[PDB]
């Protein structure tokens, strides 16, 4: 748009024309142009033959029909529209994650009505415990779980060995006590942005509860926004109300990668995009394509106004302004035509 | 993470006294606003204090447009 607008005036720039003159029409042209856009804009909600998503579906197909996944627009369009159907009403992209999972055909890329984790970390029993929980209850801990690894710094003084004995026992009972709170909650999955003591995993393994630490809070933020449960720092003040529930939890190997699976929450305004793809470059490129698709329909959800593509709009404008230029005599008139003359380029 | 100016502004906006002391939520020195929230504009997280002030307020103006350089110019003239 710009350079072509620049381009056509450039010969007129060779004429010693005061730029203020030129910009004067430019303001005039754009404003006059802009209103005509509004006038010939198209809505559907007055009309009858629209399902609230079909237009969104059409827009993305239109939007998607330029970037690298152009042959699968009919595929992803449903994904994002129904996905964006979840974004209400925070409507922000931060909620919905993108998982740039390597390998696999992008046609096998997944949208989960929940969250999955591209991440984990190896602790001792982390493999041992069950990895299926059909109707589990979800615990979200921000607080770490380890024997005073990084807590308040304090020296202690004790003469008696038994008191020395008692103390180190007591430090453990601290972690057990949280874990007892953890277990007696009756939930089955615990998440932590923070590191978790390996041993508790065994306790969780011993009692067949799942746990995970060092989690991205963002995905945790999704998780709490996904399952509706509340992230906790206080194990003791815990109650089932803040305790997440999900339709089913799992964790699956994908591209060799060790992922954690849970979806089916009927009221989950947040999903995540599992993006299979065998090229590293594809991922971000797709995501950027994916990113645009989301934000654009987001405004479309915001604004029920549509127009046709394929350069028709601009040609309509150029024509309108072209006739309009006939109205306005003089130096402006030449600008108007070139404004149209640059306009048609697309 | 508001800087001293920011709260200094904000304190004035709500007319409420900032408290270096954490505990005492004094009635008289307490905030009062028509509406406060977060909005999204230009893919930028925005904390909004929508206000209706008869006593007179230190208001704020919204700059929308493409070129930050234009904004900086436009605010300078503004």
């Amino acid at each position: 748009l710009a350079a072509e607008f620049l381009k056509q005036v450039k010969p007129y720039v060779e004429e010693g024309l005061h730029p203020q003159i030129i910009i004067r029409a430019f303001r005039t042209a754009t404003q006059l142009a802009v209103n005509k856009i509004k006038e010939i804009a198209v809505t559907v909600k007055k009309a009858d033959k629209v399902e609230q998503r079909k237009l969104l579906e059409k827009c993305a197909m239109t939007a998607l029909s330029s970037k690298l996944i152009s042959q699968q627009k009919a595929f992803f369009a449903k994904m994002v529209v129904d996905a964006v159907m979840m974004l209400d009403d925070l409507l922000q992209l931060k909620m919905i994650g993108i998982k740039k999972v390597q390998g696999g055909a992008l046609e096998d890329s997944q949208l989960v009505a929940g969250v999955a984790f591209k991440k984990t970390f190896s602790y001792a029993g982390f493999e041992m415990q069950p990895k299926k929980y059909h109707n589990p209850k979800i615990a979200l801990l921000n607080v770490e779980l380890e024997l005073k690894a990084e807590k308040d710094n304090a020296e202690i003084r004790v003469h008696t060995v038994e008191d020395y004995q008692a103390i180190v026992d007591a430090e453990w009972n601290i972690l057990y006590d949280k874990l007892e709170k953890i277990h007696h909650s009756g939930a089955k999955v615990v998440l932590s942005k923070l590191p978790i003591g390996d041993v508790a995993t065994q306790y969780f393994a011993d009692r067949d509860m799942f746990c995970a630490g060092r989690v991205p809070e963002e995905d945790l933020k999704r998780t709490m926004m996904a399952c509706g449960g509340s992230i906790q720092t206080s194990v003791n003040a815990l109650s089932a109300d803040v305790l997440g529930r999900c339709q089913v939890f799992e964790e699956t190997q994908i591209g060799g990668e060790r992922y954690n699976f849970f979806t089916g929450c009927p009221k989950a305004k947040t999903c995540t995009f599992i993006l299979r793809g065998g090229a590293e470059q594809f991922m971000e490129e797709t995501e950027r394509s994916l990113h645009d698709a989301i934000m654009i329909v987001r405004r479309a959800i915001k604004n029920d106004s549509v127009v046709a593509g394929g350069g028709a709009i601009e040609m309509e404008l150029s024509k309108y302004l072209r006739d309009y230029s006939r109205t306005i005599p003089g130096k402006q008139q030449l600008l108007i035509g070139a404004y149209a003359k640059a306009l048609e380029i697309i | 993470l508001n800087s001293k100016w920011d709260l200094r502004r904000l304190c004035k906006t709500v007319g409420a006294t900032a408290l270096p002391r954490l505990t005492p939520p004094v009635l008289e020195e307490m905030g009062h606003c028509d509406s406060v929230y977060l909005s999204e504009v230009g893919d930028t997280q925005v904390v909004v204090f929508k206000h209706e002030k008869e006593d007179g307020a230190i208001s704020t103006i919204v700059l929308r447009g493409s070129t930050d350089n234009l904004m900086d110019d436009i605010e300078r003239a503004v």
Partner: peptide, 29 residues
């Protein structure tokens, strides 16, 4: 969506209006 081109042309509009409005350049090393 209309807004796309709507914002597009407007942003372009000021761009040149920004662009054309300068007569010289100054450089500092």
């Amino acid at each position: 969506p209309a807004m796309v081109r709507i914002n597009a042309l407007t942003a372009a509009s000021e761009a040149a209006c920004l662009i054309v409005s300068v007569d010289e350049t100054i450089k500092n090393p």
